[PDB]
Amino acid sequence: DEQMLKRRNVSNQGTVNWSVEDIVKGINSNNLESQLQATQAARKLLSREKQPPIDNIIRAGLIPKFVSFLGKTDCSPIQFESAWALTNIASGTSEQTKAVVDGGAIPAFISLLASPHAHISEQAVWALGNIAGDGSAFRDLVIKHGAIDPLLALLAVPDLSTLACGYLRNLTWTLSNLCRNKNPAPPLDAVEQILPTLVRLLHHNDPEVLADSCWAISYLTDGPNERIEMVVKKGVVPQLVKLLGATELPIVTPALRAIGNIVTGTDEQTQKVIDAGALAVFPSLLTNPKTNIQKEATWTMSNITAGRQDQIQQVVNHGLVPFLVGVLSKADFKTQKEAAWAITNYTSGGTVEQIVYLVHCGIIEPLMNLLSAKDTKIIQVILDAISNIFQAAEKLGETEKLSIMIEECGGLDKIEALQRHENESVYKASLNLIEKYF
Numbered sequence: 261d262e263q264m265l266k267r268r269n270v271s272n273q274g275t276v277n278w279s280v281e282d283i284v285k286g287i288n289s290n291n292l293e294s295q296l297q298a299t300q301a302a303r304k305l306l307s308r309e310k311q312p313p314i315d316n317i318i319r320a321g322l323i324p325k326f327v328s329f330l331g332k333t334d335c336s337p338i339q340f341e342s343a344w345a346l347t348n349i350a351s352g353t354s355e356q357t358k359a360v361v362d363g364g365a366i367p368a369f370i371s372l373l374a375s376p377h378a379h380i381s382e383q384a385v386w387a388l389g390n391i392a393g394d395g396s397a398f399r400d401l402v403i404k405h406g407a408i409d410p411l412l413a414l415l416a417v418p419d420l421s422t423l424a425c426g427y428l429r430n431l432t433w434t435l436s437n438l439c440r441n442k443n444p445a446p447p448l449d450a451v452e453q454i455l456p457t458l459v460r461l462l463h464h465n466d467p468e469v470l471a472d473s474c475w476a477i478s479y480l481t482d483g484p485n486e487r488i489e490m491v492v493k494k495g496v497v498p499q500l501v502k503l504l505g506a507t508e509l510p511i512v513t514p515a516l517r518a519i520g521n522i523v524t525g526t527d528e529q530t531q532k533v534i535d536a537g538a539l540a541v542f543p544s545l546l547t548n549p550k551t552n553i554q555k556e557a558t559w560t561m562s563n564i565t566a567g568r569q570d571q572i573q574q575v576v577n578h579g580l581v582p583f584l585v586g587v588l589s590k591a592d593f594k595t596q597k598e599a600a601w602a603i604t605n606y607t608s609g610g611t612v613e614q615i616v617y618l619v620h621c622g623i624i625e626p627l628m629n630l631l632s633a634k635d636t637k638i639i640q641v642i643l644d645a646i647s648n649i650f651q652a653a654e655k656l657g658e659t660e661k662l663s664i665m666i667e668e669c670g671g672l673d674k675i676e677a678l679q680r681h682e683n684e685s686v687y688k689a690s691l692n693l694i695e696k697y698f
Contacts, residue, residue: 261552262513263436263475266390268351269344269383270309275301280316287325292335299329299341306348314352323349323363330368336377343372343383350390357394366391366405373410382427385411389434396441403438403450411435415457420464432461432469436476445483451490455480459494467508474503474514481521488525492532497522501536509550516545516553520560527567534564534571539578546583555595558587562602565609572610581621589626596630600641603627607648615652619662624649628671636683643678643689646671650697663697672698 278301286298302322306312317323329335329342346369350360365387372384388407392399414431417423435454439446458480461473477496481488500522503515519538523530545557561584565572575581584606588599603623607615627642646666653659666672675698679690 261517262510263440263472264433265393265437266351266357267386267433268307268312268348269386270307272297272300275304278302278305280305280313280320283317284320284322287322292332292338295325295329296335296338296341299326299338299345302326303341303345303348306345312348314349314356317345317349318356318359323359323365327360327363327365327368330365330372336375336380339372339375340377340380340383343369343380343387347383347387347390350387350394354394357391357398360387361391361398361401366402366407370402370405370407370410373407373414378424378427381414382430385414385427385430385434389430389437392434393437393440396444399438399441400444400447403447408438408450408453411438412454412457415460420460420469425466428464428466429468429472432472432476435461436472436479439476439479441479442482445487446480448490451480451487455490455494459496462496462499462503467511470503470506471508471510471514474500474511474518478514478518478521481518485525485529488522488529492522492525492529497532498536501533501538501541504538504545505541509553512553513556516556516560520556520563523560523563523567527571530564530567530571534574539564539574539580542578542580543583546580546587551592551595554587555592555598558584558591558595558598558602562598562605565602565606567609569609569611569614572606572614575606576614576617581618581623585621585623585626588623588630593633593635597635597638597641600627600630600638600645604641604645604648607645607652612652612655615649616656619649619665624662624665624671625669628666628669628674631671631674631678636681636686639678639681640683640685640689643675643686643693646675647689647693650693659697666698 275297283298283302286294302317326342326346329338332338346360346365350357369384369387373381375381388402392402420428458473458476461469477491480491500515500518503511504519506512519533522533542557545553548554565575584599584602587595630642631639650659650662653662675690675693679687679694681687
């Protein structure tokens with residue numbers, strides 16, 4: 261969703277607004293100092309707020325020279341300027357990032373991580389973040405060059421608070437990019453290696469470190485139950501639930517994504533978020549003003565009602581059913597569709613006493629009105645729900661009572677209509693429902 265993939269660093273008046281050809285003239289000279297100003301001039305071009313000349317710089321064949329300056333231990337200033345310049349080139353398109361990698365920048369940047377000058381090592385952290393952020397291949401390539409050890413060694417301190425705020429945020433961000441992307445997913449052992457530190461960052465007091473830490477965890481929980489388990493096993497669920505109640509949307513968003521990912525796992529994994537007290541935060545999430553938080557919360561809900569009956573009960577006890585009736589009644593269409601799933605799921609695995617409660621909460625009408633939507637999949641999900649409900653009524657000899665209810669709110673004058681729907685799964689379902697109850 262919204263975590264920045266790549267980031268450009270846009271943070272000696274003689275080195276201002278130089279011409280690319282002037283920059284080439286200086287870097288090609290055999291004067292370390294002349295090369296230094298030329299590189300700073302290049303970095304300033306790449307740091308300008310509007311349209312950095314990334315392609316012009318690449319075309320001039322400066323990347324190889326810049327990457328070579330990274331190794332000039334004797335002249336730290338040029339190491340910094342070229343690191344910053346390469347960082348910004350790497351923040352561009354895939355082809356541009358490829359140019360940096362093709363120049364042999366990865367091993368050079370990993371070497372700078374251990375630099376005595378924190379501003380230089382920070383630029384290396386930043387650059388590697390941009391490279392890994394390009395995709396799976398480069399992320400795994402950064403991992404193969406041995407970047408994880410050096411990065412994690414930068415956070416190996418008794419108290420993260422003694423570290424410079426900006427510095428910590430860059431490391432956290434870059435680390436999250438090493439956890440990012442899914443096809444393929446990060447090496448298992450690389451994830452295992454990073455998790456402990458990630459777990460430590462999830463407890464830091466900075467909103468930006470927390471936001472990115474949550475994003476990283478959300479990426480790790482996005483996949484097979486085996487992946488979810490390595491995370492859940494670290495005991496972060498309770499902390500994730502806490503961040504779920506945060507004031508800052510940038511924290512709640514990734515935190516709700518992680519929790520939503522976790523509940524797509526086993527019922528045992530789902531039970532962990534329930535035990536953490538996650539449900540108590542949903543009355544807020546399900547009415548949240550930001551439509552995406554609401555949609556994701558309803559999607560998460562739909563995966564919790566897809567669990568055991570005792571888990572569907574927890575949903576009932578927290579008074580969340582009326583909130584689902586609310587989201588089904590009025591909300592962004594995509595959120596409504598998620599509400600429909602949450603319902604159809606609830607009705608497919610809940611007890612009769614539970615499906616009865618669902619109806620007493622007023623689910624029938626809003627469910628009907630939604631049959632008036634042009635999205636054959638939702639109409640299917642809803643029809644599946646009505647059938648799952650009649651089924652429970654049949655067991656109480658209250659099918660008639662339900663038939664009338666659907667009749668009162670115009671439901672039948674919609675199902676009969678659907679009976680004449682071009683899809684076999686729909687005009688079939690309506691038929692059955694009709695001829696069987698109506």
